[PDB]
Amino acid sequence: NYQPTPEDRFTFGLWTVGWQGRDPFGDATRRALDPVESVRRLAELGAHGVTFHDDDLIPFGSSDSEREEHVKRFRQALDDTGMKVPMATTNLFTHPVFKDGGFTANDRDVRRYALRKTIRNIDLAVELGAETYVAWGGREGAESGGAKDVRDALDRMKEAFDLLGEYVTSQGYDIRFAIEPKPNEPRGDILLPTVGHALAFIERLERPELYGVNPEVGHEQMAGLNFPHGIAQALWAGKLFHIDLNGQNGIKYDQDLRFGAGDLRAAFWLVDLLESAGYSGPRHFDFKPPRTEDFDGVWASAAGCMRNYLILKERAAAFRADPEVQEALRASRLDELARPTAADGLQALLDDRSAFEEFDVDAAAARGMAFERLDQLAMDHLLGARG
Ligand SMILES: [Ca+2]
Ligand SMILES: [Mn+2]
């Protein structure tokens, strides 16, 4: 019955199950959770670990002795349970100082503060065991055209990331960075709005090897993009350092539903891809139990994240192992897609009359791709009508 175990690498942010339910239009519907309780409860559900923003773990503005107590208690709960902390991040979005951004705030003093706040938490993240440090630039962007010169902003963004890379290098840390794209919300448009834009930006950093992406299901879907396709591009680039799993119904505000909700078939094809590509990173849920729920419903929603991943993993595996699917894939020429177009080389291609001058385009055109039969096998497997 689809029971999670630590090898599944399922992780959760403190801010996920800890979301109190405040929204644009609404006061909290749930009391705050102690991070130690979340670690305990998630461990009992079969999670592998947890993640945190600085300000989730240590309230903003804490004294040194309050900070020490929060960290000691958390480290303790982790040491007790065997829960890991594979990723951490900085809150560069809540405090009003970040109203125009952290790294790309127009005010230079805010950009410097953002970097110092991030570096403090990188040290803590490393201490607690994180392999990935995420950046979600949710305040980087604009509501209006004159407010933000994007080339200058990208210069500032690059400067910031490059300084963070210099910092980790100077310390000999092994931690790597991952940019979590989002196209909009809370800014009217956010910089680096998709996986593609983040991948492209990373190529211009001084040490690109230190940076990858942390794509989120719902975020790419807020641009109407195909999340599995974007993950394939990230994999192709060697940059899928981490991933955020959740659900989203289409182009609208960022819902952060439990994984499996929203676009179920996209969830199926995503799990298929991660498993068959051998992604080995965390399966992290950046989700929020709806504010309709009480704590029982929080834990049910968290369990459902994991359950749905495991159901989908079984269905995708059954699909790929079915001889009838393997024959359909061949019928649709997926194998031919894996062959070089011209391993014979350019000159041979140019001189090959069979490729062009003498190619029977009509016979090629007439060959059906057989994609609908393939996709109905996939549907039948997902729905358990096969497998
Ligand atoms: Ca996320
Ligand atoms: Mn989101």
Side-chain angles (χ1 to χ4, degrees):
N1 202 40
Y2 305 111
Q3 290 306 294
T5 55
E7 331 79 82
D8 299 324
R9 298 203 60 165
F10 294 129
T11 63
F12 294 84
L14 293 179
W15 71 91
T16 70
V17 293
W19 182 58
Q20 293 188 249
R22 299 176 176 104
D23 75 18
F25 305 97
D27 290 343
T29 67
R30 295 184 293 262
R31 80 160 165 81
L33 279 177
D34 178 346
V36 162
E37 179 174 8
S38 297
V39 170
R40 294 174 172 156
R41 288 278 347 221
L42 291 169
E44 183 193 356
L45 293 179
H48 172 89
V50 287
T51 69
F52 67 95
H53 302 77
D54 55 352
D55 297 343
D56 297 331
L57 176 61
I58 298 134
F60 181 94
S62 291
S63 67
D64 287 349
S65 50
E66 284 165 342
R67 176 194 187 76
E68 171 60 6
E69 176 72 354
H70 288 291
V71 171
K72 180 178 177 185
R73 283 174 57 75
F74 187 63
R75 190 199 292 103
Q76 179 77 56
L78 297 168
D79 287 343
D80 287 352
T81 55
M83 286 278 283
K84 300 189 203 294
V85 179
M87 179 276 275
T89 186
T90 328
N91 186 322
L92 299 174
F93 48 86
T94 300
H95 192 287
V97 70
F98 300 125
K99 64 194 188 286
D100 190 46
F103 298 165
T104 74
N106 284 355
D107 293 303
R108 178 170 172 284
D109 54 4
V110 175
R111 299 195 299 268
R112 293 176 63 86
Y113 176 67
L115 280 164
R116 292 293 304 288
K117 190 175 192 289
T118 300
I119 289 164
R120 183 187 193 186
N121 201 57
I122 289 168
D123 284 346
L124 181 61
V126 166
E127 179 178 356
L128 298 177
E131 294 83 28
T132 304
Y133 200 89
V134 163
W136 173 56
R139 294 283 178 206
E140 317 309 318
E143 290 67 64
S144 53
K148 192 65 52 171
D149 182 298
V150 172
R151 293 175 287 150
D152 289 339
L154 290 170
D155 288 340
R156 301 296 75 80
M157 193 88 84
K158 164 173 167 62
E159 185 184 16
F161 281 107
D162 284 341
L163 283 158
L164 296 177
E166 184 184 357
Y167 179 72
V168 299
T169 300
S170 77
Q171 302 302 301
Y173 295 156
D174 295 322
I175 198 163
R176 301 184 298 176
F177 294 102
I179 296 177
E180 179 180 339
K182 192 180 187 183
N184 69 256
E185 193 206 32
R187 309 303 309 266
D189 290 291
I190 294 171
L191 304 181
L192 312 183
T194 81
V195 163
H197 299 74
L199 288 173
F201 170 86
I202 286 164
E203 295 298 314
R204 292 279 181 289
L205 297 177
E206 282 317 294
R207 296 181 171 94
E209 67 284 2
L210 298 180
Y211 312 82
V213 289
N214 183 40
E216 179 176 309
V217 175
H219 294 177
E220 306 298 295
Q221 293 175 349
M222 288 169 71
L225 300 178
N226 183 313
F227 187 72
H229 287 194
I231 296 309
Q233 185 171 174
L235 288 164
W236 185 80
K239 299 300 194 177
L240 191 65
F241 288 8
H242 194 272
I243 197 172
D244 284 357
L245 302 175
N246 64 11
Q248 174 65 26
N249 286 284
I251 307 186
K252 56 168 60 148
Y253 73 98
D254 183 33
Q255 299 192 294
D256 302 322
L257 308 176
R258 83 184 184 295
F259 184 66
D263 187 341
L264 177 56
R265 288 238 292 172
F268 170 83
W269 294 116
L270 174 62
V271 176
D272 175 71
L273 176 61
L274 296 175
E275 295 300 321
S276 77
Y279 169 68
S280 64
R283 280 68 172 178
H284 181 246
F285 300 104
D286 190 358
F287 90 114
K288 293 178 173 65
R291 70 192 289 274
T292 54
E293 306 306 293
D294 63 15
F295 288 119
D296 287 340
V298 165
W299 306 118
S301 193
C305 284
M306 297 185 282
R307 182 172 178 83
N308 290 331
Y309 189 104
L310 294 175
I311 296 164
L312 296 170
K313 176 177 176 181
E314 177 197 62
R315 300 313 164 75
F319 171 74
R320 296 291 179 191
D322 183 348
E324 197 161 10
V325 172
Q326 299 185 7
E327 181 185 15
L329 290 162
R330 293 172 188 124
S332 296
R333 292 87 73 197
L334 274 299
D335 58 355
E336 292 197 31
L337 186 69
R339 294 191 182 274
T341 300
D344 51 333
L346 177 63
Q347 190 60 237
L349 175 60
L350 290 170
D351 291 335
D352 187 0
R353 292 184 55 87
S354 80
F356 187 69
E357 298 84 335
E358 299 174 4
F359 183 66
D360 182 346
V361 294
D362 290 336
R367 297 188 255 277
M369 300 312 299
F371 293 151
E372 289 293 282
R373 179 167 181 192
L374 176 61
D375 191 58
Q376 190 59 45
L377 290 168
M379 184 71 78
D380 286 352
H381 274 280
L382 173 61
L383 297 177
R386 294 173 186 260

